[PDB]
């Protein structure tokens, strides 16, 4: 019976699935967009405003005044100016701005020369700040909570940040089917095994009624019960199986780690007779019977249609997280430098008075 599903025959598939199941209820840090440069630019805007004429200061309203409501620069800059005016209203803020810049009690001629000296500096800093602001916006949905929810959808079919647990109603799309064979199919019209947890049930469960493949996923599982007939009571058996797993992903979670996990699974799916299979398959279907199979049947999956594996909900959710992280990793690294530059521009602005006095 070497060709039947025996204890440990799905052990290596189970190690890969355990790594994926450990993405449930995840508490990870994400790569941080360094936005300290936004504050540095705001400080430059405040210095610029402080040094401006009484006529300019008088402008500061929800939109530019009549005559400028359609000027594209005023439309762009209005909220930035308004924020600077508001921040300068705060007790002793303007005095602190001027002191940092060497412009306390500055003669009027010096205030004007200083403001003019800031024109090229601010023009250089604008596009740097605008890129940093764009990165912030582009990445604002790459958060620990959004990742946890997506990964809990992947593992357990539960769109929640924490407290996700095995429940067949959520782990199998629409709950378990009439038969194990139908429950353990994914990608077909009647796709059912749409989570990592359902995949583990299908690849690892002990069916009731004899001729089961208990301990296919490892001899150290203590199957205290079974999955029932046709997965009717899979939850108790899943608890025994998952108790043997304690994979931990790298922290912070990376796109590379997630991509490597999906590639590993992809490299293990085997094609036979027009379907793909994860887990040992002998004949008939992925039924939980030792002489048939303990597997997921990727119905109609072939090497040439493998793109469809990436549309299965769990795979798509993990892929989406990986893609979000892939972008945020790079944008976080870019933002470090944008922010350091903007802080450097603030320091430059604070020095122009020394030059001009001399
Ligand atoms: C630091 O703080 C200073 C103030 O101390 C602030 O300066 C102001 O910046 C705005 C930037 O848009 C300047 O706006 C221009 O204003 C002229 C008209 O100027 C009169 O009116 C203002 C209103 O109070 C007075 O303060 C000023 O002294 C003048 O009396 C407009 O003609 C300009 O429009 C052209 O440029 C825009 C781009 O800046 C274009 O979007 C617009 O379409 C216009 O360009 C087109 O027309 C031009 C024909 O003239 C042509 O040459 C172009 O090629 C194009 O075809 C603009 O609205 C304002 O004057 C500045 N004020 C002072 C006192 O300097 C800085 O902005 C602030 N720094 C930063 C980085 O925030
Ligand atoms: C698993 O159970 C099925 C259905 O009873 C049987 O056909 C196989 O021989 C057994 O291994």
DSSP string, 178-229: SSHHHHTEESSTT----SHHHHHHHHH---SSSS--TTTT-TT----S---S
Structure obtained using? X-ray
Cross-strand partners of 277: 270, 297
**Distance of CA 59 from the midpoint of ligand 1 (Å):** 13
Q: Is residue 321 part of a domain?
A: no
Q: Is residue 318 part of a domain?
A: no
Residue 319 and residue 302 in contact, taking contact as beta carbons nearer than 8 Å? no
Identify whether residues 215 and 343 lie together within a single domain: no
Residue 202 and residue 296 in contact, taking contact as beta carbons nearer than 8 Å? yes
Q: Is residue 324 part of a domain?
A: no
Identify whether residues 105 and 156 lie together within a single domain: no
* Nearest residue (CA) to ligand 2, atom 5: 289
* Mutation probe of ligand 2 site: the residue of 6, 292, 293, 294 with most atoms within 8 A of C-beta: 292
Identify whether residues 220 and 247 lie together within a single domain: yes
CA 338 to chain centroid, in Å, comes to 22
Identify whether residues 167 and 281 lie together within a single domain: yes
Residue 202 and residue 294 in contact, taking contact as beta carbons nearer than 8 Å? yes
Q: How many Cβ atoms are within 10 Å of 300's Cβ, its own excluded?
A: 14
Q: Is residue 128 part of a domain?
A: yes
**Distance of CA 303 from the midpoint of ligand 2 (Å):** 29
Q: Is residue 329 part of a domain?
A: no
Identify whether residues 222 and 283 lie together within a single domain: yes
Q: Is residue 177 part of a domain?
A: yes
The answer for residues whose C-beta is within 8 angstroms of residue 332's C-beta and 6 or more apart is 31, 32, 33, 34, 139
Identify whether residues 63 and 83 lie together within a single domain: yes
* Mutation probe of ligand 2 site: the residue of 287, 288, 293, 294 with most atoms within 8 A of C-beta: 287
Decide whether any atom of ligand 2 lies within 6 Å of the 291 Cβ: yes
Identify whether residues 46 and 170 lie together within a single domain: no
Q: Which ligand is nearest to the CA of 115?
A: 1
Closest ligand 1 atom number to CA of residue 53: 5
What is the resolution in angstroms? 1.1
- Per-residue b/e over 66-105, b at no fewer than 16 CB within 10 Å? eeeeeeeebeeebebbeebbebbeeeeebeebbeebbbee
Identify whether residues 230 and 347 lie together within a single domain: no
* Residue that is written with structure tokens 């089917």 in the block: 177
Domain that holds residue 348: 36-138+334-357
How many domains are contained in the chain? 2
Identify whether residues 253 and 185 lie together within a single domain: yes
Identify whether residues 190 and 296 lie together within a single domain: yes
Q: Is residue 236 part of a domain?
A: yes
Residue 352 and residue 114 in contact, taking contact as beta carbons nearer than 8 Å? yes
Q: How many Cβ atoms are within 10 Å of 336's Cβ, its own excluded?
A: 14
* Residue that is written with structure tokens 């600077």 in the block: 84
Q: Is residue 274 part of a domain?
A: yes
Identify whether residues 55 and 176 lie together within a single domain: no
Identify whether residues 218 and 173 lie together within a single domain: yes
């Amino acid at each position: 019976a070497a060709d039947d599903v025996n204890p440990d025959d799905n052990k290596e598939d189970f190690a890969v699935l355990c790594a994926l199941a450990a993405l449930a209820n995840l508490q990870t840090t994400v790569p941080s967009i360094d936005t300290s440069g936004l504050a540095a630019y705001d400080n430059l805007q405040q210095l610029n405003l402080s040094l401006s004429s009484k006529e300019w200061k008088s402008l500061f309203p929800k939109q530019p005044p009549e005559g400028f409501q359609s000027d594209p620069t005023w439309r762009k800059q209005w909220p930035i100016w308004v924020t600077a005016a508001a921040a300068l209203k705060a007790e002793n803020k303007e005095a602190a701005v001027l002191a940092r810049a060497g412009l306390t009690n500055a003669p009027e001629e010096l205030r004007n020369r200083a403001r003019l000296a800031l024109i090229p500096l601010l023009a250089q800093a604008e596009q740097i700040r605008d890129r940093l602001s764009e990165i912030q916006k582009q990445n604002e949905d790459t958060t620990p909570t959004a990742i946890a929810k997506a990964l809990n959808k992947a593992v357990y079919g539960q769109d929640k940040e924490t407290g996700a647990v095995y429940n067949s109603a959520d782990c199998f799309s629409g709950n378990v089917a009439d038969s194990t064979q139908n429950s353990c199919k994914a990608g077909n019209q009647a796709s059912k095994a749409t989570t990592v947890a359902a995949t583990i049930v299908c690849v690892c469960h002990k069916k009731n009624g004899g001729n089961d493949a208990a301990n296919a996923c490892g001899r150290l599982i203590n199957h205290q019960s079974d999955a029932g007939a046709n997965l009717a009571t899979a939850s108790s058996d899943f608890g025994d199986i998952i108790a043997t797993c304690a994979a931990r992903p790298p922290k912070p979670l990376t796109a590379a780690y997630l991509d490597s996990a999906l590639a590993a699974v992809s490299a293990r799916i085997r094609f036979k007779n027009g379907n793909g299979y994860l887990g040992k398959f002998k004949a008939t279907g992925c039924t939980g019977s030792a002489a048939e199979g303990l597997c997921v049947e990727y119905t109609a999956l072939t090497a040439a249609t493998m793109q469809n594996f990436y549309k299965i909900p769990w795979v798509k959710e993990i892929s989406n997280v990986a893609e979000a992280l892939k972008r945020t990793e790079k944008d976080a690294a870019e933002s470090t430098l944008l922010s350091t530059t903007l802080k450097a521009s603030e320091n430059q602005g604070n020095s122009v008075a020394q030059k001009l006095i001399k």
